[PDB]
Design an enzyme around this catalytic site. Structure first.
Site, short mmCIF file in Angstrom:
data_model
loop_
_atom_site.label_atom_id
_atom_site.label_comp_id
_atom_site.label_asym_id
_atom_site.label_seq_id
_atom_site.Cartn_x
_atom_site.Cartn_y
_atom_site.Cartn_z
N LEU A 14 -4.33 1.38 -47.74
CA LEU A 14 -3.89 2.72 -48.13
C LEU A 14 -2.81 3.27 -47.24
CD1 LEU A 14 -7.37 4.33 -49.05
CD2 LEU A 14 -5.78 3.33 -50.73
N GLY A 15 -2.87 2.97 -45.93
CA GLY A 15 -1.88 3.44 -44.97
C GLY A 15 -2.10 2.98 -43.55
N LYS A 16 -1.02 3.09 -42.71
CA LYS A 16 -0.96 2.70 -41.29
C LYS A 16 -0.23 3.73 -40.44
CE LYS A 16 0.04 -1.94 -41.89
NZ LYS A 16 0.20 -3.38 -41.56
N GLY A 18 -3.85 2.50 -35.88
CA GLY A 18 -4.83 2.74 -36.93
C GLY A 18 -4.40 2.37 -38.34
N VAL A 20 -5.96 2.60 -42.65
CA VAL A 20 -6.85 3.13 -43.66
C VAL A 20 -6.81 2.18 -44.85
CG1 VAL A 20 -7.65 5.16 -44.98
CG2 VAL A 20 -6.50 5.51 -42.78
N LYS A 39 -11.36 3.77 -42.05
CA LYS A 39 -10.37 3.84 -40.99
C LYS A 39 -10.84 2.94 -39.84
CE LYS A 39 -7.47 6.70 -38.06
NZ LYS A 39 -6.62 7.93 -38.06
N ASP A 132 -0.64 17.55 -36.45
CA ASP A 132 0.09 16.74 -37.42
C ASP A 132 -0.03 17.26 -38.87
OD1 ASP A 132 1.65 14.54 -38.35
OD2 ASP A 132 0.19 12.99 -37.74
N1 LIG Z 1 -10.15 9.62 -47.53
C1 LIG Z 1 -9.09 9.03 -48.07
N2 LIG Z 1 -8.92 8.72 -49.36
C2 LIG Z 1 -7.64 8.24 -49.42
N3 LIG Z 1 -7.11 7.81 -50.62
C3 LIG Z 1 -5.81 7.32 -50.96
C4 LIG Z 1 -4.76 7.26 -50.04
C5 LIG Z 1 -3.53 6.72 -50.43
C6 LIG Z 1 -3.35 6.22 -51.72
C7 LIG Z 1 -4.39 6.28 -52.63
C8 LIG Z 1 -5.62 6.83 -52.26
N4 LIG Z 1 -7.02 8.22 -48.25
N5 LIG Z 1 -7.96 8.73 -47.37
C9 LIG Z 1 -7.59 8.85 -46.02
C10 LIG Z 1 -6.29 8.52 -45.63
C11 LIG Z 1 -5.93 8.90 -44.33
N6 LIG Z 1 -4.57 8.87 -44.06
C12 LIG Z 1 -3.45 8.36 -44.76
C13 LIG Z 1 -3.48 7.29 -45.65
C14 LIG Z 1 -2.45 7.11 -46.57
C15 LIG Z 1 -1.39 8.01 -46.61
C16 LIG Z 1 -1.35 9.07 -45.72
C17 LIG Z 1 -2.37 9.24 -44.78
N7 LIG Z 1 -6.81 9.44 -43.46
C18 LIG Z 1 -8.04 9.65 -43.96
N8 LIG Z 1 -8.49 9.41 -45.20
#
Ligand SMILES: Nc1nc(Nc2ccccc2)nn1-c1cc(Nc2ccccc2)ncn1
Length: 286
Positions: A14-16, A18, A20, A39, A132
């Site tokens: 989902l992202g970097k 750390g 996710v 995470k 942030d």
């Molecule tokens: N709880 C949770 N659900 C999701 N869903 C998601 C994210 C991206 C695309 C599709 C579904 N992220 N997330 C999350 C993401 C995160 N930080 C992050 C991740 C991608 C972008 C920007 C910042 N920090 C904590 N929870």
């Protein structure tokens, strides 16, 4: 209840920062398990472990409709914690808004603004400083609910101080930073209000790349500025009332709120309690 590492099935990254990832917690191994957001640390240093554990304690202590829900911790790998959270299916607000642009009207943007305010007001009651606040760190549950996520940079205020001083900054979102955060590395509820003004600006520009806070600030200081010179010129610009412009089609009253959040005097900035009251009044009037 517990989360066994062996039963967490990787689905998608989902992202970097750390990292996710989207995972299925599937102990029955029939792919009927709950989809969760996980995470974990990518460079698990002893200092980074200490901060990650504090971030887990922060999230766990927070229970609000506009704050991503803590689910648990997976130990199964103490030196390699995995934070388990609810999966929010519409992703970050930055991507959501950019994808569904002016098809989200002003009334919808103000419902999101109110939710962000409320989440931030609740965070301030626990004496936590986000540091942030940006649309990239705001997640979309559904078309009617947004939640603050990513407490990676969050600090707890000392018992006797209304600010937190960062001695050795890492990667910093400088185009969202209050002047005192740029000059003295001082973070407070007031610096989170300045960053909130920037979020409001991001919302009303509909995440147009050419209108972004880095794009606008770079143009004002000059695209020829590089490295630490960007921070030097940005401080001088802010001290001399250089501000982000009024986004195209932005109502006057919303731009007024942005300009009040962007006050050089820390004490003159509005409170999140007053912003939620004001934003709910605008929505009511509309
Ligand atoms: N709880 C949770 N659900 C999701 N869903 C998601 C994210 C991206 C695309 C599709 C579904 N992220 N997330 C999350 C993401 C995160 N930080 C992050 C991740 C991608 C972008 C920007 C910042 N920090 C904590 N929870």
């Amino acid at each position: 209840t517990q989360f066994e590492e062996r039963h967490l099935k990787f689905l998608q990254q989902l992202g970097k920062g750390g990292s996710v990832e989207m995972c299925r917690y599937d102990p029955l191994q029939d792919n009927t398990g709950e989809v969760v957001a996980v995470k974990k640390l990518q460079h698990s240093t002893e200092e980074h472990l200490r901060d990650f554990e504090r971030e887990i304690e922060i999230l766990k202590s927070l229970q609000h409709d506009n704050i991503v829900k803590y689910k648990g911790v997976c130990y199964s790998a103490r030196r390699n914690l995995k934070l388990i959270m609810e999966y929010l299916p519409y992703g970050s607000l930055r991507d959501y808004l950019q994808k569904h642009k002016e098809r989200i009207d002003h009334i919808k943007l103000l419902q999101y603004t109110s939710q962000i305010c409320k989440g931030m007001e609740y965070l301030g009651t626990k004496r936590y400083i986000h540091r942030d606040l940006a649309t990239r760190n705001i997640l979309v549950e559904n078309e009617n609910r947004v939640k603050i996520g990513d407490f990676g940079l969050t600090k707890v205020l000392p018992q006797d101080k209304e600010y937190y001083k960062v001695k050795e900054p890492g990667e910093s979102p400088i185009f969202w930073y209050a002047p005192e955060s740029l000059t003295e590395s001082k973070f407070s509820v007031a610096s989170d209000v300045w960053s909130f003004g920037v979020v409001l600006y991001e919302l009303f520009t509909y995440i147009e790349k050419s209108k972004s806070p880095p794009a606008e600030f770079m143009r004002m200081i000059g695209n020829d500025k590089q490295g630490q010179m960007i921070v030097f010129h940005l401080i001088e610009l802010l001290k001399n009332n250089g501000r982000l412009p009024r986004p195209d089609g932005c109502p006057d009253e919303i731009y007024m709120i942005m300009t009040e959040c962007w006050n050089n005097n820390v004490n003159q900035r509005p409170s999140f309690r007053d912003l939620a009251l004001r934003v709910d009044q605008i929505r009511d009037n509309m």
